[PDB]
Write a protein that binds this DNA or RNA. Structure first.
Ligand SMILES: Nc1ccn([C@H]2C[C@H](O)[C@@H](COP(=O)(O)OP(=O)(O)OP(=O)(O)O)O2)c(=O)n1
Ligand SMILES: [Ca+2]
Length: 425
DNA sequence: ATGTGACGCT
DNA sequence: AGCGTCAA
């Protein structure tokens, strides 16, 4: 029996992260229907983050502020810092590197997103079981939800959870330390603990998902939001997946999952457990078949990586519709500004992490082209110089102008510089 | 006309 | 090397 209960993986996401960061800075926005805005010019600005009070009005990410004011009239709005013509997210990066430092103190983290990190707690948990030859109280888990529980023979929201917790806390075997359920339970305490520190030392709230692998830890987190954690066990999986849409799983949100639906003619994840391993390999490849077969039975061996630091530093600028760049001088100018921000971020990164980028990546967009990026060329980053970068960034794309006149440009919907291929310093 | 970053594939 | 997929 290849348990599928080898590791203990947690996943922590900050609840309406960007909003909180503003709410902490501006006290007047806390416990208020509010949102983070970007570029007031076009339609009051596009929304990139929504407080959960404003999520009651139906305000969502990717929506113009003017339109959201029609749903939530008294929607308080914070604005994003702007840098040389573009939005600047230095505040949330600096606010993110805060939380990572804290999660690091407990265990090794994989920076999935800016407000997310994965934690492999196998080592840490076992090193607690020896120091705790004794039961586990419910008071050590005041925000933990046991998925699937309760059931059988407690009316409102926190009325339950308690029962599901109690029903669970009885069933577990504190005697058997190899008991995977016991491990997750202990991890949840450890997760509860680090969460409390995050809120104490930053003032920020977050949800967490605890399970045996990364993908389940992900889904578990999003189950009970906000400021709650959810424990998904091996036993919760079959009953859970049977009603759980496939689109609601990492990687399966894309067109892969779309085909998987219409190819096999299904809806939920539990319906994959029928098909053999070789069948799913026959449709989606040896890699996907092996993965889907394991994952539909709640198994995934994609490991948590010691990667608290990114591998690519980049900044983008989009020029939608008639705002496209049709001169060499606009392009020359913007590439500079883009390279200017990239430089100070690089010199920053260097002074903190003691490392340097070596290869400059340039990427563009044209009009009448759907895909996010059309062309993309590497360079060679040797000097953190906002000019040498952009000048070379121009050089590696100077040819792209299809105009007979050199002063113009034929046009760009987007530009994207990216410093990568790092090296130790 | 919403506006980074990681990874797989050829 | 360049492009495609996926998600925050
Ligand atoms: N397409 C996106 C996705 C995220 N973010 C920013 C804003 C988010 O606050 C933060 C993380 O977004 P999440 O998807 O993790 O979810 P939220 O933090 O917005 O709230 P919640 O966790 O309650 O869903 O990164 C963004 O600007 N654009
Ligand atoms: Ca979030």
């Amino acid at each position: 029996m290849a348990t599928g209960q080898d590791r203990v993986v947690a996943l922590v996401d900050m609840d309406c992260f960007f909003v909180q960061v503003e709410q902490r800075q501006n006290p007047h926005l806390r416990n208020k229907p509010c949102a983070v805005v970007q570029y007031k010019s076009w339609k009051g600005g596009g929304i990139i983050a929504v407080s959960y009070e404003a999520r009651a009005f139906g305000v969502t990410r990717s929506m113009w502020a003017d339109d959201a004011k029609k749903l939530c009239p008294d929607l308080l709005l914070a604005q994003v810092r702007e840098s040389r013509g573009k939005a600047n997210l230095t505040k949330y990066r600096e606010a993110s590197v805060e939380v990572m430092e804290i999660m690091s103190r407990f265990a090794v983290i994989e920076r999935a997103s800016i407000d997310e990190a994965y934690v492999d707690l196998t080592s840490a948990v076992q090193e607690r079981l020896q120091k705790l030859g004794q039961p586990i109280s419910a008071d050590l888990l005041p925000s933990t939800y046991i998925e699937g529980l309760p059931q059988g023979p407690t009316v409102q929201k926190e009325g339950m959870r308690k029962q599901g917790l109690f029903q669970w806390l009885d069933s577990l075997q504190i005697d058997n330390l190899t008991s995977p359920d016991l491990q997750l339970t202990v991890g949840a305490v450890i997760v509860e603990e680090m969460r409390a520190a995050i809120e104490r030392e930053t003032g920020f709230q977050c949800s967490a998902g605890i399970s045996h692998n990364k993908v389940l830890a992900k889904l578990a987190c999003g189950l009970n939001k906000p400021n709650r954690q959810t424990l998904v066990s091996h036993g919760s999986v079959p009953q859970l997946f049977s009603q759980m849409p496939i689109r609601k799983i990492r990687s399966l949100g894309g067109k892969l999952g779309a085909s998987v639906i219409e190819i096999l003619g299904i809806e939920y994840m539990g319906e994959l457990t029928q098909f053999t391993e070789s069948q799913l390999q026959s449709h989606f490849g040896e890699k996907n078949g092996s993965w889907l077969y394991a994952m539909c039975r709640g198994i995934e061996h994609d490991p948590v990586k010691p990667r608290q630091l990114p591998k690519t530093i980049g900044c983008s600028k989009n020029f939608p519709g008639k705002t496209a760049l049709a001169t060499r001088e606009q392009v020359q100018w913007w590439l500079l500004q883009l390279a200017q921000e990239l430089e100070e971020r690089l010199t920053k990164d260097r002074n903190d992490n003691d490392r340097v980028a070596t290869q400059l990546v340039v990427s563009i967009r044209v009009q009448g082209d759907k895909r996010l990026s059309s062309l993309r060329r590497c360079c060679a980053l040797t000097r953190y110089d906002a000019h040498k970068m952009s000048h070379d960034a121009f050089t590696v794309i100077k040819n792209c102008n299809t105009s007979g006149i050199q002063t113009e440009w034929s046009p760009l919907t987007m530009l994207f510089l990216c410093a990568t291929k790092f090296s130790a310093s």
